[PDB]
Design a protein around this ligand. Structure first.
Ligand code: HEM
Ligand code: HEM
Ligand code: HEM
Ligand code: HEM
Ligand code: OXL
Ligand code: OXL
Ligand code: OXL
Ligand code: OXL
Ligand code: CA
Ligand code: CA
Lengths: 306, 312
């Protein structure tokens, strides 16, 4: 049975690779990764000059922000929980939720693409880096190239060698007894249908979201032609709170919510606990990032707008 | 040329290559690492959104790019954030205050209650709620029954800050003997810096940071005013890295370094500066930008069920 379980898991999931994956139409180079890193930490991408990507997707805090939903410009609370940047490169479901038929600069940073490009153009070192990272382009300082540089840096923010990955690679005892029982439940209860593959989710939209009605529960939104991403569960133990709205702080409680009659699933307290223990095995090696030294503004650089 | 380098070599000292030793606060690897984790941990703030790095950003010259800092609740504060870089060498802990208040100050720990909106007890509670922090404090502060205290927190942060120094600026290399580390304009600027009396208040190892004087910049839109009649004083800041710690003065009212220099060419000091002289001095001030610290971003431990929730 232990052998059977491991083989079953090996046919449903894959481990995080050791190296950054290659991105569609966006190749990595050392200078582009360094540029992307600088941009990711540079709060001058925001109108206020106070907020960077790292503010909400904090590389030292599991790639998130420790918040129910993110706070942005003006202390405005946003509508959604910031998903982790960690392993985000492997996801294909770009948004938390939206209309199934319906499915840019961050609004919470309060800057237009042209304002961002103006800011980058005002700093010669950035212009020079853009020329090195996107060579043979007349004017490489475009919002799309900025995004590409950030994305190659994000591709490096992956977390290999979690206990579950070591289990997938062959080591049964990478998971303890409780975690192993949790894995069996995760498969038998059908969690893997929506939270499977390389990233244990992040690839599918489903007409189910968590709402306040055991205080929270899954509701069926197909009648509304509305869907939610089933998130990647990698590093879930360190990306609390949970769900699109950040309404549940306990991982065990989040699992219990997912033990929903909407899925034909029932979970005892012990079962939810075992599954939560298993989800703890998905915490990988956190990225080692040298904090970027970002270049000085000049007299041409826009002033902060608060 | 040789007389200028020699007199400079007597009035200033270069930034050391090693972090200075802090009395009663030994740097150990684990204490430095802990200090770093704390410096970047926004759970030191009530909101869990603001860390020391938010306002003293290691990648932005140790400051925040703002006229005055924006803290908890998007509240604009009264003062410009001074750089963390080389702050270890300073003695004047405040931008300004009453002379009777700032006289006989003793060095105390960082308290940022308005900025971060946490009390010392709330901070200690937060740290005690995370086993990895408790364990790190025990390693960094051996032989103490309960090492998780506000003072030890501050000590750990202080040993980390001691590493945030910027050696090998062109001026420092000039001090160490390389005349051509400064170009012609910067060299002209240095002579002016000495001759015009700037060094009187912006002298020594950090080119300032050690004295309070009864002069502050108030609303060529800004000028120095004499505040002795009001028994009030202002810090003469360390000018190290000044080219990258704009905007300038206590209120962050002047964005141009040349203009800041021109304001400091004040009749209040008996100093007169031509425009060319202010440009020359500003060029010299640019030579004070040192090597920026290379910091591996800390991986900070997960909160637990005991950890206070964000208070926005
Ligand atoms: C340019 C800087 C930023 C970058 C590169 C970035 C990156 C990302 C990524 C990769 C995702 C989706 C992850 C996935 O597909 O698995 C995302 C979504 C999100 N980010 Fe950011 N982010 C940035 C700035 C911010 C800031 C400053 C905030 C907080 C104020 C924030 C909050 C969010 C939120 C709430 C979502 C979920 C949006 C939704 O699906 O409705 N982001 N971001
Ligand atoms: C007991 C089995 C399951 C477990 C343990 C489980 C686990 C979880 C967890 C921990 C989250 C929160 C992730 C985060 O916030 O980053 C989540 C969210 C989600 N899961 Fe599951 N899941 C299970 C079954 C399913 C199934 C079968 C589906 C698809 C039909 C699914 C779809 C989703 C969706 C759409 C969300 C986002 C909901 C929202 O944010 O409102 N889950 N799941
Ligand atoms: C615990 C984290 C923090 C640490 C360790 C820290 C460190 C320091 C240091 C060392 C100084 C004086 C510099 C010197 O002595 O040369 C200072 C002053 C100052 N910092 Fe911070 N700081 C922290 C948090 C913050 C935050 C979050 C903000 C912004 C909201 C901020 C804004 C300021 C301002 C405005 C001053 C000048 C205060 C005055 O003199 O009136 N600090 N800080
Ligand atoms: C032309 C000669 C001088 C030059 C080039 C010069 C340069 C500067 C610069 C660049 C600043 C802004 C530093 C910052 O914001 O980080 C400053 C501030 C200051 N300097 Fe000078 N300085 C000169 C003469 C003096 C003298 C003689 C004194 C003392 C009597 C002095 C005391 C101060 C004080 C108190 C401040 C802070 C004022 C405020 O923030 O309102 N300076 N100086
Ligand atoms: O820096 C801030 O004030 C923030 O994150 O909102
Ligand atoms: O901090 C929490 O609430 C957690 O880890 O579940
Ligand atoms: O950005 C500025 O204004 C500067 O460098 O003086
Ligand atoms: O963390 C601190 O030092 C504070 O909040 O005063
Ligand atoms: Ca979350
Ligand atoms: Ca400043």
């Amino acid at each position: 049975a232990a052998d059977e379980l491991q083989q079953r898991a090996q046919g449903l999931f894959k481990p995080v690779p050791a190296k950054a994956p290659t991105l569609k139409g966006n190749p990595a180079s050392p200078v582009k990764v360094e540029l992307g890193k600088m941009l990711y930490f540079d709060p001058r991408l925001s109108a206020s000059h106070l907020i960077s990507c790292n503010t909400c997707h904090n590389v030292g805090l599991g790639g998130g922000d420790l918040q129910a939903t993110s706070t942005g410009h003006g202390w405005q609370k946003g509508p959604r929980n910031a998903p982790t940047v960690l392993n985000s490169v492997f996801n294909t479901a770009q948004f938390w939720d939206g209309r199934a038929k319906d499915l840019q600069a961050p609004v919470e940073m309060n800057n237009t693409p042209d304002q961002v490009v103006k800011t980058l153009n005002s700093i010669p070192d950035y212009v020079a880096l853009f020329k090195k990272a996107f060579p043979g382009e007349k004017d490489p300082v475009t919002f799309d190239n900025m995004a590409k540089a950030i994305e190659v840096f994000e591709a490096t923010l992956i977390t290999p060698d979690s206990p579950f990955d070591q289990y997938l690679k062959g080591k049964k005892k990478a998971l303890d007894g409780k975690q192993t029982a949790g894995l069996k439940l995760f498969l038998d209860k059908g969690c893997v249908a929506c939270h499977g593959g390389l990233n244990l989710g992040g690839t599918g939209y489903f007409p189910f979201g968590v709402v306040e009605k055991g205080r929270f529960a899954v509701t069926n939104t197909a009648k509304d032609e509305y869907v939610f991403r089933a998130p990647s569960l990698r590093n879930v133990a360190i990306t609390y709170p949970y769900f699109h709205s950040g309404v549940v702080w306990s991982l065990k409680e989040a699992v219990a919510v997912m033990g929903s009659a909407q899925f034909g699933i029932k979970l005892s307290d012990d079962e939810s606990e075992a599954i939560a223990a298993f989800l703890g095995s998905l915490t990988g090696k956190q990225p080692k990032v040298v904090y970027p030294i970002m270049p000085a503004s000049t007299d041409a650089t826009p002033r902060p707008r608060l």
